[PDB]
Every structure is written in structure tokens, then in C-alpha cells.
Subunit: 119 residues, 3 copies
């Protein structure tokens, strides 16, 4: 059934903000220090840029579940119950990710509209 | 290797039935009663409508794995071994879902064909 | 943040090699011997063909994480500790799979470019 509501065709300001996000190829700093430029290329969008094109059109990318934000506490380096080291933990950081399946949807809705030639 | 068969380019009646399905934005009745219209927008397709546009073109959406159906038994409210309540369970219902990765494929095959300008 | 590097718009030789890959409908030999042609149709790309269109344009599909390869040892038929059978195992084989989310990205980047009408 429908466990859904506020149901309707896709906002145009939204589709118009998405049309603003860019596609990139990039390598993960992770892999690259591991295998040098042996590291594979990945293709996709970039959260920080996304959160931005929606900001210009005056929207929030978080509201459409296109983007996530995550933040954390700085976890101890612990030697116990001696001067001995068991684990080396975390420096405080944060990270933006994306919710790819919601991004593909809006992308394909976007490219549906252009093909009707409304852009 | 190929663990595959009945291998061929994509049916045109199929692509023609898919071209029939609509994209929506909606909110989950779940979230909405939780956080009011604080609730995020999600973008996608809607199973019941899908099962329908294929029915008109005379096809079954289930055969291409675009859609799922699920149904269940009504599970007891149980107080044991006293008049005491441990768990409150289920009223019988059903639910249609979608298989999103198969849906994106057909969507992109669809929008490949239009661009050759076969639509 | 960005845990990313070698960051840039998407290679054109790459996009040009991808434009080369075909979409298919097929059934799994698995399902088909199970339920006959009761077996559902699935839509998508085919790894072996992918690895090939990139080879012609002179690229490797593995480098962009579009494709995987997997190979295995031949595991014993074991009856223990008698002439009795417990498990029937594996004949050595291999298998190419795909990494679908990376494939959709490049597909949608591809169909973005054609719509600017650079193809
Ligand atoms: Br990697
Ligand atoms: Br939500
Ligand atoms: Br199946």
C-alpha cells in the first residue's frame, strides 16, 4: 500500500537546484596513499558542492535526504592497565556523505524533464 | 562468466510500459506524524502505479522484478503468563514495495532510447 | 569533508568508452532451470562486454571500479570420517560481476553530456 503522504510530482525549484550539482571523477585519499595512482577512479557527486547549489537556490539539501552529516568525539589513546598500548583511537572530525539512491532518482527525474525539453 | 540466458536487448513493449510510470515526491506517513512537516522529502516511483501502467500495456510488472508484494498474519497481543502485557503485535496488512536497482536500469534504458530519438 | 583527491570532471575517453556498453534483458540460468520461463526478466549491463568496449578504446574497466573478477579453488567432496557424505562442494570456476552504483553514475554522466548535445 501507500505508507506515503504529501504526495505529488517533483518540485521545480528542487529539480532546478539539482540541475546545479556537478558530476566528478576522483580518487580516495585512502586508496591513493595505499597503492599510489594504482588507485581506481570513482564517479559521482560531491556532498559539499550539493549542499551549496541548493543554498543558492535557497533550499536545504538535507530536507530531501540527498546529503548526510556526521560528527564525532575525540577518543582516547589507551594504555592499560599499564603504560602499554592496546588501541590507538580517534581525533575529532566530521564528514559529509551522500544518499546515492535518492540522488539517482532526482537526477533521472531531472533528465526526464529536459527531454520533454523543459530544459 | 555468464550465469545468464534468454539474453537480448530490452523488450520495446516493456520500455513502452515503463515510459508510462511517473516520478513523485512524497513524505512517509511514518516520519510525518513523528516530526510534522519537518519530515524530509523523498523522490521516486510508486509501486501501485507501476503495476498499473504495465497492466494497461498488458504486461505484469512482477515479471521484470520491478515490484514486490508482501502479506502477513495478524499476530496476538500477548500478556503472559498473567494478565500482564509484554508485547503489542500486528494487525494483518499487506504492502507493495519496489526493487529500485531494477527500476533505475529500465529508466536509463528508456532514456537511452529517447535520445537516439526513438521517442 | 573531502577524503577525496585526483578530483576533476569525468574523463572523456572514459565517457566515450562507456557510451559503448549495451543494455540487455536476460534471465538467470539459475532461476530458469528452477521455474522454467516462469523466471523473471532482469535488466542491466553485462560485465564481459563492458571489459571489452573499454579495451577497444584502450582502457581498463577495472580501474574505474565498473567491474569485478573473482576466482576460486576446487573444494573436496567429503565423506567423514566414514564413506558417508556430509557436503558436496565446489568445482573450480570464476565469475565477473559488476559494481552497479558506479555503472549508474557513469551512465547518467554520459546522458548528461549527450543532452548538452556533445553527442
Ligand atoms: Br579503491
Ligand atoms: Br525521514
Ligand atoms: Br528470479
Amino acid at each position: 500500500e501507500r505508507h506515503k503522504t504529501d504526495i505529488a510530482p517533483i518540485s521545480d525549484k528542487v529539480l532546478d537546484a539539482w540541475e546545479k550539482v556537478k558530476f566528478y571523477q576522483y580518487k580516495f585519499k585512502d586508496a591513493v596513499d595505499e597503492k599510489g595512482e594504482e588507485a581506481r577512479y570513482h564517479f559521482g557527486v560531491i556532498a559539499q558542492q550539493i549542499v551549496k547549489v541548493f543554498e543558492d537556490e535557497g533550499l536545504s539539501a538535507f530536507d530531501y535526504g540527498l546529503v548526510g552529516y556526521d560528527e564525532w568525539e575525540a577518543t582516547e589513546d589507551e594504555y592499560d592497565s599499564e603504560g602499554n598500548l592496546v588501541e590507538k583511537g580517534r581525533e575529532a572530525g566530521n564528514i559529509y556523505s551522500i544518499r546515492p539512491t535518492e540522488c539517482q532518482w532526482l537526477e533521472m527525474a531531472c533528465m526526464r524533464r529536459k527531454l520533454e525539453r523543459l530544459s
